[PDB]
């Protein structure tokens, strides 16, 4: 009989939970039709503008000047044009204002110091494709839709059948929940997919945090996998944004996150070191097994392959 498979996505904000949900829709559901894609044009532009604005705000805070003094008027114009722009369309005026700012060396300098503030990882994706996106005849591709960031109102869920299993994937993400709500989310969970943004390793400590983002994530993973209530639940670990981590490891040493790291700064040793940090938190290596996969949630092919392997685990873990 097609038993129910309740999947709970957990992890810090921006770790890729929403993205995994949309990949399921693209992989095991109907995905997005062109008509549905056109519907995202407005959020694509909103996200694009929010991104350039985030970088501009950081320049003021970090005190980074524009490569060209003229860009200051563009920045102000950016705010007025955006505030009057109709949702869904981008004028040649706003497009130019954004292209000039994104091009500015000062803006790029701030963009490259994103570890010092909080910039969404879709910023570069859209900002680099201003040629394609700005055109009035623009039709968001499936990948563009995947990259959109939307308003998270309450628990999100998605249904889909895979290998004669009724998957119910839940993501509480963001929406602050009460003890009751969480207990309800946990009861019935067949497997937990814990997402981690590998690229968060070089993030500057916030004013009110005792430990860096990576260690906060480790603290939570520690409570989850060692909690007796999940003894039988499959604990899947997604070390995500491996693509961003790989790009970063070149310039920002892992020693930023783990001052004790004495390995080399290759993608391989740094990633392995992080895999061990999380997996070693398991206090019952004899009993529980952690199923780790390095991912790129925005890569449908990779997610498909990985979710395929997670399913095989769910099946056999069902002592059958």
């Amino acid at each position: 009989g097609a038993r129910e498979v309740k999947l709970l996505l957990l992890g810090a904000g921006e770790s890729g939970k929403s993205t995994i949900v949309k990949q399921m829709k693209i992989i095991h559901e109907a995905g997005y039709s062109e008509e549905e894609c056109k519907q995202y044009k407005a959020v694509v532009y909103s996200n694009t503008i929010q991104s350039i604005i985030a970088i501009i705000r950081a320049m003021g805070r970090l005190k980074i000047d524009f490569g060209d003094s003229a860009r200051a008027d563009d920045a102000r114009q950016l705010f007025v044009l955006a505030g009057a722009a109709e949702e869904g369309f981008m004028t040649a005026e706003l497009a130019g204002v954004i292209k000039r700012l994104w091009k500015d060396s000062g803006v790029q300098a701030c963009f490259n110091r994103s570890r010092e503030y909080q910039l969404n990882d879709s910023a570069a994706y859209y900002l680099n494709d201003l040629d394609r996106i700005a055109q009035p005849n623009y039709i968001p591709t499936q990948q563009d839709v995947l990259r959109t960031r939307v308003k998270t109102t309450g628990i999100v869920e998605t249904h889909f059948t895979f290998k004669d299993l009724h998957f119910k994937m839940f993501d509480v993400g963001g929406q602050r929940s009460e003890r009751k709500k969480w207990i309800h989310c946990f009861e019935g969970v067949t497997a937990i997919i814990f997402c981690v943004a590998l690229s968060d390793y070089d993030l500057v400590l916030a004013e009110d945090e005792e430990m860096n983002r990576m260690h906060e994530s480790m603290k939570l993973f520690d409570s989850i996998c060692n909690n007796k209530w999940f003894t039988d639940t499959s604990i899947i670990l997604f070390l995500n944004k491996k693509d961003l981590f790989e790009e970063k490891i070149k310039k920002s040493p892992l020693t930023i996150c783990y001052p004790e790291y004495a390995g080399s700064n290759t993608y391989e040793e740094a990633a392995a070191y992080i895999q061990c940090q999380f997996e070693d938190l398991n206090k019952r290596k004899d009993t529980k097994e952690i199923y780790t996969h390095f991912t790129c949630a925005t890569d449908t092919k990779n997610v498909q392959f990985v979710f395929d392997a997670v399913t095989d685990v769910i099946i056999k873990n069902n002592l059958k």
């Binding site: 929010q50 705010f79 969480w182 906060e216």
Partner: protein, 36 residues
Amino acid sequence: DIEGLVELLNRVQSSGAHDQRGLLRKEDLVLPEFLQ
């Protein structure tokens, strides 16, 4: 205490980039002080 875990979940899952998710809103359009 599970109540402690719940606290940890809300704290960890709510962190991250702000004002960078929905449709444009008058709040995300405020002009940064250094540009006034």
